[PDB]
Amino acid sequence: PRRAPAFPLSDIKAQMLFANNIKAQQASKRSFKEGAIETYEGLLSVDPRFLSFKNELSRYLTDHFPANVDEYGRVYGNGVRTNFFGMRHMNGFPMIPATWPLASNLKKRADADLADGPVSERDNLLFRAAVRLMFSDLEPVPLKIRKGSSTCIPYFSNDMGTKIEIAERALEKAEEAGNLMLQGKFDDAYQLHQMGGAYYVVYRAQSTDAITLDPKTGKFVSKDRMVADFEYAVTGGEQGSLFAASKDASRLKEQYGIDVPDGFFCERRRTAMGGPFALNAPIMAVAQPVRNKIYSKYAYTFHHTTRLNKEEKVKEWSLCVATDVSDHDTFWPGWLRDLICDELLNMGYAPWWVKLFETSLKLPVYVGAPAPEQGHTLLGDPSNPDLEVGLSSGQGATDLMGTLLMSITYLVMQLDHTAPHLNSRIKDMPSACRFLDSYWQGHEEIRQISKSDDAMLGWTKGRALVGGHRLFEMLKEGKVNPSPYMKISYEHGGAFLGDILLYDSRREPGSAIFVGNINSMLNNQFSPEYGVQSGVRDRSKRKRPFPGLAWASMKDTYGACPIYSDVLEAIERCWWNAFGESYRAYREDMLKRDTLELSRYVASMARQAGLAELTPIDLEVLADPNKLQYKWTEADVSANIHEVLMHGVSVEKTERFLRSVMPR
DNA sequence: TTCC
Ligand SMILES: Nc1nc2c(ncn2[C@@H]2O[C@H](COP(=O)(O)OP(=O)(O)OP(=O)(O)O)[C@@H](O)[C@H]2O)c(=O)[nH]1
Ligand SMILES: Nc1nc2c(ncn2[C@@H]2O[C@H](COP(=O)(O)OP(=O)(O)OP(=O)(O)O)[C@@H](O)[C@H]2O)c(=O)[nH]1
Ligand SMILES: [Mg+2]
Ligand SMILES: [Mg+2]
Ligand SMILES: [Mn+2]
């Protein structure tokens, strides 16, 4: 049923994805690589003392703090939703092999029994209403750019200077490029404006995955992660094969002579896509304004910040269901892409821009090196973009696409199983927009708070509430998928945006509170996703600019956790056994050092002014700028701090571009 | 060296 066209790096189609410069060329050639990460300055993830520490701490915590999650996934008690064996990984060493990204997910979706388009006219209206509400009255904003991020295909530059030029150029010729694409002249578009080509596969680490201890064997067991081989990938599942990547770390001994203590495994590898910047720029220029709108006007269901911010909304519900979507990104329906594009045209968006947007969502992917002796293959023909990979992470709006899909999906899941008496309110676009608008503002007896696949569905006192309970029960029994669109189920240990929803004996939304996830504190502090890159001189360009700062926001971020104090003590203790030092002291010094260093980057900061002026969010973002791409928004961060991490383009240049794009 |  149509196998995807594939080309070797030697092929001219692949060659053209990389500019005639060192960086680009190395990216294309880059072979498989692995190695211990520098968890903290001067400390390797595989250091014996460290692993030892990790072994004792994980075991002890898991033993003294077993999970407290009821038959309904509600977490009560100690707030622990699972064991602590997640830290038992050799950070820096991936499972082998990584997956080959699927060129088409149509079959994957069908076999999963998911619809190939809106199933009812209502649903069709709702999705289209979602588009109208989201992309309507948008205000221009400067186009911010992450510092030290790669522009990827074709240049692979990191120079903010070059990035800015690249972007500004894009906004100027985006229009001419799009028209080119409307004429089906993709190659011209790519050659003249670098808008097209492919996504460059980058492999992010999931430093902590499921690991269990078999009471029978006394042996540890790492959760299997299925991965598709090249055949499977190019045939959408028709041929080839799916299988568990190997997480066994024994190899480390024989290969690198690294001592591997029993019960430690290789890291899980998530695949990510680096989009061609010339293309994502014009998209990001619209995406941000869309973000601002829904985070403002529809803040009830979309703008979340503090544990209490969340708490307020959820407390007023009679029922709160914590949903969960499996492999959201690879399942994301191509039809939604096309629907959104069609509706945007209707709303009056420039055809060329919509074409750009559409193309960005069906572009080919260049696979680097999923494993030793593997990779360097371009999937899909750049000349005529026709892939269906679902959401492509590096695209300029993957969060909006995910939200647009899941928010409506959840609303529908509610209508379908709990509120048919509302169906009559949705008869046409107008009535639909009106309903959806009211709904997103939290003004109906059914509600939701969400971000892509993570969400909490609520029910106030009313007709729908008895239905909610049946739904939740359907989810518990889990034998029937409540949606025709994605595969939904309840989250075991319900949590939202990193905060666990803590129930008491009542087991009701009103007598509940949001607390940080304790395991996440552990994950972050001992299993970071990247090392400290002490080699990169510019800290603002590192994946972890100021690691030591996280200590300052810790009490704030996790203090509320039921076993906070206990864990800190357990750590302090085990760290002592392992290093003969105070962990507290260690982090305290790191803290002082980084606070001093930070001032060298923050203007307004006296060349030694404390963290007095900084907020907890500021600190967490400075230690992990990644969180700025999912947990928080530019608006939730101190202006002077956001400047350290991001750099923008003239509000004028974007404002002018945005004007030629929007309808009104 | 390698995404939002
Ligand atoms: N641009 C980008 N978005 C990411 C990245 N990682 C997670 N996301 C966001 O998170 C969503 C995917 O949710 P995850 O929980 O990470 O994974 P999943 O594919 O849904 O499935 P699980 O593996 O079962 O959790 C997407 O909608 C993205 O917007 C990443 O590296 N880059
Ligand atoms: N957009 C984005 N989201 C990320 C990224 N890393 C973690 N996340 C968020 O975290 C989710 C699962 O990714 P994990 O890395 O397992 O999460 P974690 O914060 O380490 O901890 P858990 O909540 O216990 O899974 C995603 O659904 C994202 O929303 C990242 O690089 N980009
Ligand atoms: Mg998920
Ligand atoms: Mg997840
Ligand atoms: Mn959740």
Q: What is the full DSSP assignment across A474-532? A: HHHHTSS-S-SSS-EEE-SS-EETTEEEE--SS--GGG-EEEE-HHHHHHHHHS-SS--
Residue A490 is assigned to a ligand binding site:
yes
CA of A554 from ligand 3 middle (Å) equals: 25
CA of A322 from ligand 2 middle (Å) equals: 17
For residue A626, the ligand 2 atom closest to its alpha carbon is 31
Range A277-332+398-517 has CATH code 3.30.70.1600: yes
Give the whole-angstrom CA distance, residue A14 versus residue A198: 9
Q: How many helices (H) and strands (E) does chain A have?
A: 25, 23
Q: State which residues between 585 and 614 of chain A bring their CB within 7 Å of strand B.
A: none
Q: How long is the CA A572 to C1' B2 vector, in angstroms?
A: 35
Q: Which nucleotides of B are covered by protein (CB under 7 A)?
A: 1-4
Whats the size of chain A, residue-wise?
664
Nucleotide nearest to A630 (CA to C1'): B4
Q: How long is the CA A398 to C1' B4 vector, in angstroms?
A: 8
Q: How long is the CA A448 to C1' B1 vector, in angstroms?
A: 41
Closest CA to A28 of A160, A155, A190, A195: A155
Q: State which residues between 129 and 158 of chain A bring their CB within 7 Å of strand B.
A: 145-146, 148-150, 152, 156, 158
Resolution in A: 3.0
Cis status, amide bond into A509, omega within 30 of 0: no
How many other C-beta atoms are found inside a 10 Å radius of the C-beta of residue A112? 14
Q: Is A206 a pocket residue for ligand 2 (Cβ < 6 Å)?
A: yes
**What sign does the CA torsion over A50, A53, A55, A57 have?**
negative
Helix (H) or strand (E) holding A621: helix A616-623
In CATH, what number does A37-91+518-606 get?
1.10.490.60
Q: Is A523 a pocket residue for ligand 2 (Cβ < 6 Å)?
A: yes
Which one-letter DSSP state was computed for residue A562?
T
Closest CA to A101 of A393, A478, A531, A313: A393
Give the whole-angstrom CA distance, residue A157 versus residue A22: 10
For residue A325, the ligand 1 atom closest to its alpha carbon is 20
Q: What is the full DSSP assignment across A564-611? A: HHHHHHHHHHHHHHHHSS-HHHHHHHHHHHHHHHHHTT-SSS-TT--G
Q: Is A343 a pocket residue for ligand 1 (Cβ < 6 Å)?
A: no
Give the whole-angstrom CA distance, residue A164 versus residue A85: 44
Protein residues within 5 Å, CB atom, of ion ligand 5: A 454, 491, 495-496
Structural contact between residues A562 and A78, judged by C-beta atoms closer than 8 angstroms = yes
| Complete edge-to-edge strand list for the sheet that includes strand A199-202 | A6-8, A377-379, A365-367, A199-202, A272-274
Q: Strand runs (DSSP E) across A73-142, as ranges?
A: 89-94
Residue A92 is assigned to a ligand binding site:
no
Helix (H) or strand (E) holding A153: none
For residue A495, the ligand 2 atom closest to its alpha carbon is 23
Give the whole-angstrom CA distance, residue A625 versus residue A575: 27
Paired tokens of A435: 């309903």
CATH number for A607-664: choose from 3.40.1260.10, 6.20.410.10, 1.10.10.10, 3.40.50.300: 6.20.410.10
Query: Which ligand is closest in space to the CA of residue A498?
Result: 2
Helix (H) or strand (E) holding A50: helix A48-64
Residue with tokens 């949606």: A483
Domain spans of chain A?
A: 1-30+102-276+333-397, 37-91+518-606, 277-332+398-517, 607-664
Give the whole-angstrom CA distance, residue A264 versus residue A267: 10
Residue A63 is assigned to a ligand binding site:
no
